[PDB]
Amino acid sequence: ALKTKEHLMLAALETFYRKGIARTSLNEIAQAAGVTRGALYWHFKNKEDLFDALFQRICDDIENCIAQDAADAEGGSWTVFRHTLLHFFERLQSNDIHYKFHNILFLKCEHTEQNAAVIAIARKHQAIWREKITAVLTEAVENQDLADDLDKETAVIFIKSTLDGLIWRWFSSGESFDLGKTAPRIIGIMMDNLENHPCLRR
Amino acid sequence: LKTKEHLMLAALETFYRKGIARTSLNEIAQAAGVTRGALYWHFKNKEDLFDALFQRICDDIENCIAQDAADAEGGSWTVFRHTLLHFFERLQSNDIHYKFHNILFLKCEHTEQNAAVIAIARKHQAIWREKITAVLTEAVENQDLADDLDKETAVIFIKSTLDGLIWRWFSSGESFDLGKTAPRIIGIMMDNLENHPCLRR
DNA sequence: TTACATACAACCACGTATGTA
DNA sequence: TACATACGTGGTTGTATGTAA
Ligand SMILES: [Ca+2]
Ligand SMILES: [Ca+2]
Ligand SMILES: [Ca+2]
Ligand SMILES: [Ca+2]
Ligand SMILES: [Ca+2]
Ligand SMILES: [Ca+2]
Ligand SMILES: [Ca+2]
Ligand SMILES: [Ca+2]
């Protein structure tokens, strides 16, 4: 019977991805899941609770692969950081669930205060990235991989901005360019800038 | 036109503070000084109001980008740096341009059924593709950038760099000083186009 | 005729109550 | 329980109508 709930959340993701969330009625999710609105209201209080339960689960799974890809990675924290970033963008192509998650967060939702769950998922995703980037940066200067006078506060903004822009451009372009070729270049330039550009120094 | 200008600016603020989908034309009307009869007179529906409001603003954005470059303070690539710097100063000081980008980033759904949103996004992107491409060709015909620069990747690299700064600044709730951050991130971006070998072919 | 305000009719989505197995 | 169906409601929309420029 729990298959019905997982069907609903995946039907929610698919419908959220093709119509945006606001234009998605609970009836449309139910029809896409081959069920009725009674099924949804049974498992979920409303559309907000369905979006939150769906995007809390996916956001946790994203945090897990970034953690799992790093723990199974040999080398220094700064070497596996490139490793974790490349796999993140590979999942954007190959992992449909993670792909739709990010695409919905960037393009097909309104980040405004009345959409409480959207603002909550966005901050959760950003706090995850802030946590990973911050810890990687401290470890990378404790190993001379980056200079000990690195402007690390500016570095987190620089890193997250660079990656958000690639994700945004890729989505907003309608995937007009090859993420598999572009992301390695943009990440390498980003990491080269953190090693050698003087403006990322204090 | 005084009523029509009130409506579009009231639409701009209401679109900004509540998002577009959650914005009834009733709320726009009472956020303005009028009723829905005023809106349906000047506009066919919410999409026609959003398009007229956002075609006019996006044109004004394209005009300041052009006006500050036509006030050529130096070479084509030297002027390009300042067109970008003036663009991010406008995002702080110009409340209309600020909302426009804020509404066209975190306050709207880029989905096919919202025809005018997709159309304005395409326009705004085509604006930047034209400016960036023309700047890049003039900058290699002046040796400011190398003759083997990956021009196709350069536009993606430039627009991604700028969209990410705008996205991050908005998404963080303006957590950081863009007056200080954008010059740094622009300069690193422009230094990368001069000297990074991966922006070469 | 314009330039609106008000009135009217309709639907769409929602939440809940209820049937049911 | 785990749904499907039925019911009642409001919010938004679009249009019709009124009315003073
Ligand atoms: Ca719909
Ligand atoms: Ca509303
Ligand atoms: Ca007002
Ligand atoms: Ca201002
Ligand atoms: Ca009147
Ligand atoms: Ca209700
Ligand atoms: Ca009855
Ligand atoms: Ca209607």
Residue numbers in the entry:
A (entry chain A): 8 to 209
B (entry chain B): 9 to 209
What text does the study give?
The mtrR gene encodes a transcriptional repressor of the mtrCDE multidrug efflux transporter genes. For example, MtrR represses directly the expression of rpoH, an essential alternate sigma factor that is important for gonococcal oxidative stress responses; DNase protection assays revealed direct MtrR binding to the rpoH operator. In this work, we report the crystal structures of MtrR bound to the mtrCDE and rpoH operators, which reveal a conserved, but degenerate, DNA consensus binding site 5′-MCRTRCRN4YGYAYGK-3′.
MtrR was crystallized with a 21-basepair oligoduplex of the rpoH operator. This structure was then used to solve the structure of a higher resolution Semet-MtrR-rpoH complex to 2.60 Å resolution by molecular replacement (MR) resulting in final Rwork and Rfree values of 19.9% and 25.6%, respectively, after refinement and model rebuilding. The root mean square deviation (RMSD) of the pairwise alignments of all corresponding Cα atoms of the two subunits in the asymmetric unit is 0.11 Å. Furthermore, the MtrR residues that contact the rpoH DNA are the same for each subunit. However, the average major groove width is 12.5 Å compared to the average major groove width of 11.4 Å for ideal B-DNA. Therefore, the major grooves of the DNA are slightly widened, which likely occurs upon formation of the complex when α3 and α3′ insert into adjacent major grooves of the DNA. ; however, in the MtrR-rpoH operator structure, one subunit recognizes a 5′-TpG-3′ step at position 13Bp14B and the other recognizes a 5′-CpG-3′ step at position 14Ap15A, again where stacking between the R44 side chain and cytidine is maintained. Intriguingly, we observed nearly a ∼6-fold higher affinity of MtrR for rpoH than mtrCDE. Indeed, comparing the contacts of MtrR to the pyrimidine in the 5′-YpA-3′ steps within the rpoH and mtrCDE operators reveals shorter distances between these interactions in the MtrR-rpoH operator complex.
